[model samples]
Target chain A: MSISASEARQRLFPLIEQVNTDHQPVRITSRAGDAVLMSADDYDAWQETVYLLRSPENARRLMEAVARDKAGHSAFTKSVDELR
Target chain B: MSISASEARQRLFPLIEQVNTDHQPVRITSRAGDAVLMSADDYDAWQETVYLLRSPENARRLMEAVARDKAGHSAFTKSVDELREM
Candidate 1:
């Protein structure tokens, strides 16, 4: 959902309620598109996920790990006694 | 600057140290052209920057604001005070 920045300010409370209840961002545009307003909770969740996937390396590792699992590379783990 | 994933793992300590000390990344390639290994701190900084620019709409607002400031919309102090009242 989108509205101009001025319109967003005019209907600010309603738009804020919509974002809170819907968990969707309201994009506020200027002549070149302006800003986004989202609930703090949604922004927090996104920030957490983005932080977790901080490096491209993390993504590649996950992809390869999934592929390896599918290729019959089951748990290579052993019990503690096995170390003895 | 680039090495195979196998080599990265085999020489893990030196490579890890390299990333830590130099604050750079290592590109680890498989046959599929996969993987990067970056220093934790540098990666954290990148994530913060990414969060700041997450919204394209917001980015446009910043750019427009700068343009307006450069184009002599400087007499807007009263308007700002009006917003402060709200």
Candidate 2:
């Protein structure tokens, strides 16, 4: 079963316990829409990759590593995500 | 002699040599108008401090250091410079 929002927030630490939590991205999807709320690093990396593309100059390792994560979630693209 | 534009652009390395290159900001005045041309780092730091103030959030050490420089150049708030790049 997909995780729910209130459930996720209430027991956030256990979720952290389950995940590796070693500099990993955390994307907690909304129970209602299955959307995401995540660590700031995740947002910054996504913004840079899409906009400035300067992670190559400013954050080369993080850029390539995010590319690895993006490869896994390649199926999530839709017009709704772009509007927000 | 005041440094001419062509002279500053051409023998730029000598000017760099005259100043500290280990990350000291270089501001070569126009000599004609006593205006400035400088290293890109100088400009970026200035832009961040003046605009987003993000240097504090994004570039803390650089922000603090640029604050030091801005303290010195605080007298240079002429109307001409601010409108160039916003």
Candidate 3:
């Protein structure tokens, strides 16, 4: 969803409510720049993903682990039930 | 920062601006529940983090990778300069 800055300013409360309820982003445009309004929870999740992927070495290892898991070569050889 | 829903409603514009400018969350409380208001950019970053960590297997692998990296056991042994053309 998109809106002019002035319109966003006028209907700020409703817009906030909408983003919080819908978990969707609203883009507000103006002469200076544009900004997106989104739910706090959603944004927090995205931040965490960025942090995890920030380190190239960590990211590479994680990808390798995923590949290994997919190929049935995971280090976790025993099933959860068996471990118990 | 925390404020009552009624106060948040009254000062909605300033609150929004504050969150956007400061990149901080504001907690608004009501009888029904509480809601946090934060910058869209910050919120989006956090959402991305959640998506990356959602899968248990992936989270495990990522954590393991982090441990390996800290222990200097990463697979990529070559330095970045070695791969670049002079």
Candidate 4:
């Protein structure tokens, strides 16, 4: 949705292609004009990955994180396969 | 994982059902111990809904939300095509 100055140059084309091909916009900048502004879908995917990496229970735990800073999460997984 | 006192009273049994049946835990509190917690699957589904409502481009615009986030989605659609945006 938004882009930053630095990202605008390095990642613009790939981002656009990503958006076009995958529906996710590449982030060349941040919404605050510091990081990167990515397509909404792209952002979700990235954030999900980040969270999963940080937490082994990512798939099993559940909660609406109000925002990155808010960090609100809920639910716990005995293990992912428990679901199956 | 966490639940508020009030929520624990009102939603405990049902929440257990959701967790057991639907795989979602009903909420009754906030994270500061004032709210109810839900199963992770439920939370993701709920938050995803909120984001979609706010942004028409939610599905179209893809990125890694990093947290409470689905992560790196992309691919677009034309007017007369089948769009598998998800």
Q: Could you give the DockQ of candidate 3? A: 0.03
The runs of at least 3 residues in candidate 3 whose Cα sits more than 4 Å from the true structure, single-residue gaps closed, are: A54-84, B1-86
For residues B1-86, write the lDDT of model 2, one tens digit per residue.
Answer: 23666677887777666543544444546646654444566556555544443222454554455557766355344323665546
lDDT of 3 at B60: 71
Candidate 4, residue B43: Cα displacement in angstroms equals 9.4
Of the candidates shown, which would achieve the greatest lDDT relative to the real structure? Answer: 3
- List chain B TM-scores, each candidate: 0.52, 0.34, 0.54, 0.28
* Candidates, DockQ: 0.09, 0.03, 0.03, 0.03
Tell me the whole-model lDDT of each prediction, alpha carbons only.
0.75, 0.54, 0.77, 0.52
Q: How well is candidate 1 docked (DockQ)?
A: 0.09
User: What TM-score should be assigned to candidate 2?
Assistant: 0.24
lDDT of 1 by residue, B35-69 (tens): 88879887787666565665555556755775587
For every candidate in turn, the CA RMSD to the true structure comes to 13.4, 15.8, 25.7, 16.2
Model 4 stretches astray by more than 4 angstroms: A1-52, A56-84, B1-4, B30-32, B40-86
